[PDB]
RNA sequence: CUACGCCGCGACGAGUAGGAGGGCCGCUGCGGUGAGCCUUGAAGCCUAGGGCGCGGGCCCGGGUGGAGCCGCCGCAGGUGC
RNA sequence: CCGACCCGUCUUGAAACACGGACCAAGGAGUCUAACACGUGCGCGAGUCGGGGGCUCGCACGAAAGCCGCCGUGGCGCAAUGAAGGUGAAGGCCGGCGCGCUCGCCGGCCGAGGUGGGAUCCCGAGGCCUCUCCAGUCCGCCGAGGGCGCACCACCGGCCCG
């Protein structure tokens, strides 16, 4: 025998889509030859972002692409997100935008085509660029989830703030007995 | 079964050393410890205020506070199977300066130098240290006298 | 258009023709240096004993540099200290070998690992036919036996190592690229020993087969590979 | 026994609540006995508005 | 889904996934949260801080229809009236504001979190913040009160 | 489209026959009648198929044209073949090849027209 | 080239409690599909019959029996001793 | 001929002088509900959800499916904090005046700050081309360095409540 160790030998990543979309494994197949098929390492990172999870895709807002897009030097070029492109409200002057996302919200996609932008697909995102040239590969926040919030370290330790698992919030939900120095103690 | 008194078993570890009482030299007073240089905790017992626990004696770590009696140092103790950077408060008679770093500073300065020097009068030096390489080939001679031979001696019942 | 771009290929073909040509008289003149040099060494070293004898005086010869350390021992309860050094050796299963260039680090990583590996010195025999018969190249972190000449060279290229013979001389005579040489080699992996060991479990000089024998591990070579 | 971390749960399960139990099984049915009854209101009062004042 | 479930893989294991040593009893350790404060002290002290204990005034006959006062922030503001009533604001040659009545769009107190667009507005509330009024102000508008 | 079309039947279809490690794939113009994206015969704009004639002598090689796709009644023209052997496989060559009518498929049709006008001489004992 | 497909190269393979994946392993019922099978013989059962699969198991011949049964895509379990 | 102790089981240790088991057939044990938590798949997305009600030949299937929108009441989310009264999340710079008093009146713009990392993307010296040359035609590839920096991490500021 070898004195190795196989606990790590089986990486454990995610080598094709778990969703059955269809439409979804087509661009899967599209985007897997061309990661193959070209030196660009832009399809290969989108192409792996093809297979993540919704969760792992977070969606975009429209005031954080507008932001992005803002930064010198990237004007003229495609923001290009593997996910959702969202609405949002708090913004008020959309600007001109070339734009190829996953799914774009209906009133995501009203304004930003009532203000002279561009919608495209990943398959018109391949005709457009296959190498990826041009393009601004932008992500939504991956950590901007409420379960984020409860993870950490333990509610009851020593500067921690983690978000403990309460099911009411209120004065009789969980304040006494650790979290004021009259009732035992606060770490 | 081991009590857990704070100064269990520095029975030997914080005393003085032999014919070493007294006044505390006051060159020990006297250091200047800036943020991010190393010392070591030694602890010693004439002191009793501002003492470092009896894991930290002889620990290494990198200061990062500086009070009008004492240093902060982050100090790595191991705590069964992880490590972690403790940060505690020692008066500056507990500690010294590290002479490694001390002299690894020395190297340092001694590198940039001999790397400008050389590359401005034309020739490639080594830096690096290697380890001890093999012994080389030399002559050994005689000087005309044959080498002296050597018996084991016999046996005999000392006392 | 047919006969232009038909010249312009047999253009290439024979650039390539002549670029081959040119690497074989580059590789045939290396080993005929190298053929050179290794015989200088040879007489050297038997020269310089011999005029030290004519003055009455003694030649102590330059101490060996290079190592062939072989893994007698299996995997079974092995302490943890010794377990690390082994795999630093890339020692993982019994009856592998590996060359060690020698210095102070490497001698103390040898003396804890002594009662488990049986050492000494290679000679130049020695270091052929384990690279010709037992030579492995770790490309692309797989076990591609050196059957070609260009295996070599695409991974060893940049240092100079461009055949097997290069290889070997960079490994016997340990230069400034033994690292990478020597990491290129996968460890050899040695049958066992033809004829059957003394002893696994004493020392060499106690009638065993662990520990250092200096010159003596060439004899264990030729029965084990 | 509690598990890592999770939240402190007080189902209201002590009770023999098996004995009271209601299933809506008969809602479809109550549905439409429902809309039958509304029909049956306002062929009675003719011209009446069927909701009613 | 039966099928999709581990005892459909735990056939012909003895144990059913619930080892030889300890085995499947029935309640080791008591009942729902019992002993949280001697045999659970740690889980309790440690995941949910607070839990023992009583902390301020008790208050009979709470009625949550009293204190309802949902807020809106200045940044979500603008999109409590039409598309077409911001535009037509900001062309107006004339400085006529629009009135945003955010107690019709169901909202009583206006928060100030965020900016607000460089044009006049009539803010129509039953309360408002500090910074909610001062922002308001700052873009030439005016805040009214309500009842 | 064919892909799409083939990501919904690649494995949920009635002519499919998933038997003894095997797949095959029964619509009517697949040639080798195996399931694969190739040789289906009904997702693919221009398709062609080899089959035996209404009586028992010739093949019947029909192909689908380019204008009716959803007009499943016209969609095939059938052309029957009733010649000897050699020059059949050769008017079906120059159908596939000339035309550049699903060149990929011009051996399996051959190979397909072989294996019907064999089937249709007389046995042996 | 059923791209959920096919091919190439290298290393490796112990396992209780335990976890995970695959199962064209198996039972029963439902929605589809097989212009499916069947009194010219279904289910069941027996067999020194022929085989397949690492295996769970399965297919086929012979006999008995005398009216129902199964494959594939999904769905649901009172689903394997 | 070689090997070969009886399974299950608790056990540090079972072939055990430890317990159950004479044999065969049939039955026979992690289910359902509720509540959480995390992971994954799907729809929509600062929203989302009709689940209770109502409307459609009153009903084989159909106790299904479809529709409501002045049925979105409501739930959950979009705001936190304090025992509570209550309060409640915008900053960066250039300028003139007090005193640019550790600072107030404003203007102007920009619209969540900065440092160190940071996939990807952009610029790019200089190279890779043909029978050859002095003279450029259009783009293809490599590439020293340079630039904007997603998500995320560390840190430093900033804002809200006590
Ligand atoms: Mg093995
Ligand atoms: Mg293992
Ligand atoms: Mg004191
Ligand atoms: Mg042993
Ligand atoms: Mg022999
Ligand atoms: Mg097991
Ligand atoms: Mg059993
Ligand atoms: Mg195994
Ligand atoms: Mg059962
Ligand atoms: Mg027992
Ligand atoms: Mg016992
Ligand atoms: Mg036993
Ligand atoms: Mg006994
Ligand atoms: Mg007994
Ligand atoms: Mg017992
Ligand atoms: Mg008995
Ligand atoms: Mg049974
Ligand atoms: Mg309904
Ligand atoms: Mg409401
Ligand atoms: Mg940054
Ligand atoms: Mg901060």
């Not at chain 6, 050769?90 to 397909?112: G, V």
Request: glycine letters at 8%; hydrophobic letters at 35%.
């Amino acid at each position: 025998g070898v004195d190795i160790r196989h606990n790590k030998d089986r990486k454990v990543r995610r080598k094709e889509p778990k969703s059955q979309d269809i439409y979804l494994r087509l661009l899967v197949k599209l985007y897997r030859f061309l990661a193959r098929r070209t030196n660009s390492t832009f399809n290969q990172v989108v192409l792996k972002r093809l297979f993540m999870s919704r969760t792992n895709r977070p969606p975009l807002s429209l005031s954080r692409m507008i932001r992005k897009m803002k930064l010198p030097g990237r004007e003229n070029k495609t923001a290009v997100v593997v996910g959702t492109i969202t609405d949002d409200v708090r913004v008020q002057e959309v600007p001109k935008l070339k734009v190829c996302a996953l799914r774009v919200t209906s009133r995501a996609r009203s304004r930003i085509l009532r203000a002279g932008g561009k919608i495209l697909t990943f398959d018109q995102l391949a005709l457009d660029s296959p190498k990826g040239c041009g393009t601004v590969l932008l992500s939504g926040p991956r950590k901007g989830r409420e379960v984020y919030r409860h993870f950490g370290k333990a509610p009851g330790t020593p500067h921690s703030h983690t978000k403990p698992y309460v099911r009411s919030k209120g004065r009789k939900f969980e304040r006494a007995r650790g979290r004021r120095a009259s009732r035992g103690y606060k770490n | 079964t081991n009590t857990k008194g704070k100064r269990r078993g520095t029975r030997y570890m914080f005393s003085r050393p032999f014919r070493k009482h007294g006044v505390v030299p006051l060159a020990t007073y006297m250091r200047i410890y800036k943020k991010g240089d190393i010392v070591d905790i030694k602890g010693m017992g004439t002191v009793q205020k501002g003492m470092p626990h009896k894991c930290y004696h002889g620990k290494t770590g990198r200061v990062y506070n500086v009070t009008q009696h004492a240093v902060g140092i982050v100090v790595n103790k191991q705590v069964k199977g992880k490590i972690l950077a403790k940060r505690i408060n020692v008066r500056i008679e507990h500690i010294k300066h590290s002479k490694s770093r001390d002299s690894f500073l020395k190297r340092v300065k001694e590198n940039d130098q001999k790397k400008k020097e050389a590359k401005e009068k034309g020739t490639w030096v080594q830096l690096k240290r290697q380890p001890a390489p093999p012994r080389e080939a030399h002559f050994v001679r005689t000087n005309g006298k044959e080498p002296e031979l050597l018996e084991p001696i016999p046996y005999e019942f000392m006392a | 258009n047919f006969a232009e771009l038909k010249i312009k290929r047999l253009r290439k073909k024979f650039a390539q023709k002549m670029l081959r040509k040119a690497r074989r008289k580059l590789i045939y003149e290396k080993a005929k240096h190298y053929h050179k040099e290794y015989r200088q060494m040879y007489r050297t070293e038997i020269r310089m004993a011999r005029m030290a004898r004519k003055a009455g005086n003694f030649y102590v010869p330059a101490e060996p540099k290079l190592a062939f350390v072989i893994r007698i021992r299996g995997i079974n309860g092995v302490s943890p200290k010794v377990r690390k050094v082994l795999q630093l050796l890339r020692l993982r299963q019994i009856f592998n070998g590996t060359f060690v260039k020698l210095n102070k680090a490497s001698i103390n990583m040898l003396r804890i690992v002594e009662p488990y590996i049986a050492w000494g010195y290679p000679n130049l025999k020695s270091v052929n036919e384990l690279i010709y018969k037992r030579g492995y190249g770790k490309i692309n972190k797989k076990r591609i036996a050196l059957t070609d000449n260009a295996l070599i060279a695409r991974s060893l290229g940049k240092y100079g190592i461009i055949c097997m013979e290069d290889l070997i001389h960079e490994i016997y005579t340990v230069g400034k690229r033994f690292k990478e040489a020597n990491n290129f080699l996968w460890p050899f992996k040695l049958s066992s020993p033809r004829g059957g060991m003394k002893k696994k479990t004493t020392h060499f000089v106690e009638g065993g087969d662990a520990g250092n024998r200096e010159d003596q591990i060439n004899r264990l070579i030729r029965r084990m590979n | 026994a509690p598990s890592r971390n999770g939240m402190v749960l007080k189902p209201h399960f002590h009770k023999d609540w098996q004995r009271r139990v209601a299933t809506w099984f008969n809602q479809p049915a109550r549905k439409i006995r429902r809309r039958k009854a509304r029909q049956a209101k306002a062929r009675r009062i003719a011209p009446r508005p069927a909701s009613g004042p | 889904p039966s099928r999709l479930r581990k005892t459909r893989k735990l056939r012909g294991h003895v144990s059913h996934g619930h080892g030889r040593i300890g085995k499947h009893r029935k309640h080791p350790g008591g009942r729902g949260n019992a002993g949280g404060l001697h045999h659970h002290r740690i889980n309790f002290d440690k995941y949910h801080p607070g839990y023992f204990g009583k902390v301020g005034m008790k208050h009979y006959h709470l009625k949550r229809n009293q204190s309802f006062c949902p807020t809106v922030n200045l940044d979500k503001l603008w999109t409590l009236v039409s598309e077409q009533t911001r535009v037509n604001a900001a062309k107006n040659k004339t400085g006529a504001a629009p009135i945003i009545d955010v107690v019709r769009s169901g909202y009583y107190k206006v928060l100030g979190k965020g900016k607000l667009p460089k044009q006049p507005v009539i803010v129509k509330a039953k309360f408002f913040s500090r910074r909610a009024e001062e922002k308001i102000k700052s873009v030439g508008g005016a805040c009214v009160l309500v009842a | 489209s064919a892909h799409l079309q083939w990501m919904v039947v690649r494995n949920c279809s009635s002519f499919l026959i998933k038997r003894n490690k095997q797949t095959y794939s029964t619509e009517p113009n697949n040639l080798k009648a195996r399931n694969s994206f190739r040789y289906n015969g009904l997702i693919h704009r221009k398709t062609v198929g080899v089959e035996p004639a209404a009586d028992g002598k010739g093949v019947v090689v029909v192909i689908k044209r380019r204008s009716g796709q959803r007009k499943p009644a016209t969609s095939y023209v059938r052309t029957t073949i009733n010649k000897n052997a050699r020059a059949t496989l050769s008017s079906i060559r120059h159908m596939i090849r000339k035309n550049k009518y699903r060149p990929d498929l011009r051996m399996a049709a051959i190979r397909r027209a072989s294996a019907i006008l064999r089937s249709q001489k007389p046995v042996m004992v």
